[PDB]
């Protein structure tokens, strides 16, 4: 939703 959120998600 938040690109910071996004990255976490694939991290």
Structure commentary:
With 11 residues, the protein is an all-alpha fold. 73% of the residues lie in helices and 0% in strands. It is built from one helix and no strands. The chain is elongated and about 15 Å long.
Task: Summarize the structure in short.
The PDB classes it as antibiotic. With 11 residues, the chain is an all-alpha fold.
Q: What attributes characterize this protein structure?
A:
mainly alpha; elongated; monomer; 11 residues; 73% helix
Task: Outline the secondary-structure elements.
Layout: H1 3-10
The number of distinct helices, counting runs of at least 4 residues, comes to 1
Largest sheet: none
Name the overall outline: elongated
Oligomer: monomer
DSSP strand content: under 5%
């Amino acid at each position: 939703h938040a690109l910071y959120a996004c990255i976490r998600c694939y991290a």
